[PDB]
């Protein structure tokens, strides 16, 4: 279950152990309904819901957007697959669900994938048309990779206010379903069926993001003393909620970064820290006040923090970072018991090229990545998965030169980089400050690491020996 290629090229980390509910009350529910209705209509000002098609689903399936992918392509080509979809949709239009599989017979597999299409048909517009994208939603970050999220926190840091602060009920589900009020009747019926029966047993990412935006809007309202204690059991003067949303809702949305259950909020002051009563009544929490962060570069978001670094020419980038033990520990884990050398080497290359794109600023990872890429045949294609995060978009899964990919991601298509001058040398690309690298787990200066770095070419040649000296290798170390 260990990746032997990564393990052999990371010997200093062999001794690193880090590597080796009651209902919300009536007033709370009315607040939730008011805020949810408001936000859905704001999100729908510039977008109209639509039914996604069989043809869109087929096009998506053919690009995986294991060997199950070949089975899925065969399924969507099968007329029997779509006849079964048509029959189950007949049930959905009556508010029932019968053949859908939510959690090995080919019939069971067809109806699991058919359930996925029915969800995509009814609710795929949320992702396909980027309803929770930051442009449309203020607080969402849908579509952004780890290479961009840090810029959002940097922008939020510029707003005045306090520090930065970092379980779906049936009532949350009812509020999510309010989007169906913007649909035609057929579409609304299809969406209500998918919402109800998926819950009863990615679209849930968009709906999770919506619910979290509502929750954070409510927390700000409590923090700013618009909502009072008695409003938990009976909302007095509900129009005050509408007035606050009108006056302040968009400003507060733009003070948020929300990705599913992950969120950062920049409130207008630090009353936010103890605004926990509606949060708790909604079952979303303990009464300890939240601890805020004064430094935006330390705020955790989507398992990372984000650091502003400068190229030699003075242009800045904002990079994702996490403790190095987590990155090396994951790369050393192989999920396949088959333990094929080629599949293992190709997965190691995937991790190395990920590090070159996103974690190049870690001294240990740039060296270890170049060692891995020098030890795996240059023609072998990266395979496997290196992260479960929706914000790791997989640009490293390629045989293209990673400096060209780096340039595309950080320069060419980076909207925060107006100067599009290409970077022609890896030596122009910065590391973290040494103290910051050390803070996040770097072994620089540790004698076993120095020895590993000094003899890394010997270790690379040993891996090549094991994989096969007649393969073709490139030298990324010199
Ligand atoms: Zn069904
Ligand atoms: Zn870090």
Numbering used by the authors: 321 to 340, 364 to 408, 417 to 454, 471 to 533, 542 to 576, 606 to 689, 695 to 887
Report text from the authors:
The flaviviral non-structural protein 5 RNA-dependent RNA-polymerase (NS5 RdRp) has a central role in virus genome replication and is absent in the mammalian hosts, being extensively targeted for drug discovery and development. Similar to other flaviviruses, ZIKV NS5 RdRp adopts a ‘right-hand'-shaped structure, with the three main domains named as fingers (residues 321–488 and 542–608), palm (residues 489–541 and 609–714) and the thumb (residues 715–903). The active site of the ZIKV NS5 RdRp is located above the palm and is surrounded by loops protruding from both thumb and palm domains, likely to be involved in the stabilization of the RNA molecules during the extension. The priming loop, responsible for the allosteric positioning of the 3′ terminus of the RNA template at the active site is also present in ZIKV NS5 RdRp (residues V785–D810).
We recombinantly expressed and purified ZIKV NS5 RdRp (residues 306–903) of the MR/766 strain. The first 15 N-terminal and last 16 C-terminal residues are not visible in the electron density. Due to disorder, parts of loops 1 (residues 340–363), 3 (residues 408–417), 4 (residues 454–471), 5 (residues 533–542) and 6 (residues 576–606) are also missing in the model. Similar to DENV, the ZIKV NS5 RdRp binds to two Zn+2 ions, one at the finger (G439, H443, C448 and C451) and the other at the thumb (H714, C730, C849) domain. In ZIKV NS5 RdRp, they correspond to aspartates 535 (disordered in the structure) and 665, respectively. The priming loop of the ZIKV adopts a closed conformation when compared with the equivalent region in DENV2 (ligand bound) and DENV3 (ligand free and ligand bound), providing a smaller binding pocket. ZIKV RdRp priming loop has three glycine residues (G793, G801 and G803, respectively), which are replaced with bulkier amino-acid residues in DENV2 and DENV3 (S791, A799 and H801, respectively). These substitutions may provide additional flexibility to the ZIKV priming loop, thereby allowing it to adopt a closed conformation, similar to the ones adopted by JEV and WNV. While electrostatic surface of DENV2 and DENV3 are positively charged, the ZIKV priming loop binding site presents more neutral surface charge.
